[PDB]
């Protein structure tokens, strides 16, 4: 249907998609090292299966002045703590996960 909002609403320059990732087994740490992600963790009790909130680019950018700029959408990341296997022992470490989808400018 035709609703005024498709014309007058606030849109994104880049389209993304958020999902819940619970089958992550590897990731790169803050040292850029590849590390193993535990499927589970447990706080002085039962276990919490490790899940992650991720947002990546949904399959140039919208509203770009194509006369002076080239552009593209791309997935940026964030650092989040996680129970990992450092390649030696189990540790709480910051891993890199998808977190947003942004627009990249480049002059013409």
């Amino acid at each position: 249907s035709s609703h005024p909002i498709f014309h007058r609403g606030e849109f994104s320059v880049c389209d993304s998609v958020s999902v819940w990732v619970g089958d992550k087994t590897t990731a790169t740490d803050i040292k850029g090292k590849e590390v193993m992600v535990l499927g589970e963790v447990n706080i002085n009790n039962s276990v919490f299966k490790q899940y992650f909130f991720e947002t990546k680019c949904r399959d140039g950018c919208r509203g770009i002045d194509s006369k002076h700029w080239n552009s593209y959408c791309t997935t940026t990341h964030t650092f989040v703590k996680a129970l990992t296997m450092d390649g030696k022992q189990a540790a709480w470490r910051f891993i890199r996960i998808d977190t947003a989808c942004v627009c990249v400018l480049s002059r013409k």
């Binding site: 249907s1 609703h3 005024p4 909002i5 609403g9 849109f11 999902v19 819940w20």
Partner: protein, 101 residues
Amino acid sequence: VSFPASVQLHTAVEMHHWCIPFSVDGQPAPSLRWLFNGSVLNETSFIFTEFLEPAANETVRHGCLRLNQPTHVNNGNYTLLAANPFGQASASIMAAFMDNP
């Protein structure tokens, strides 16, 4: 001339924020109220009702239930209740913003 409230909802869409588009008519203008799964939805800064600017020569209003990054926990049936002195008009819609393992 005063007339009863009329209401309609549209299937939720994702723009910058997610939005459940609505259109309501009536005069006096109806008061809006949302229900999530049959129970009242309290608006907050992340889930709130939003009207577009009023058009000239028309009583009909357009807007959105605006959801700022909702999760699977916001999946459900959304009911918009529009009320004025003649009674109440109602419209519902199912919305899914995220799966939920």
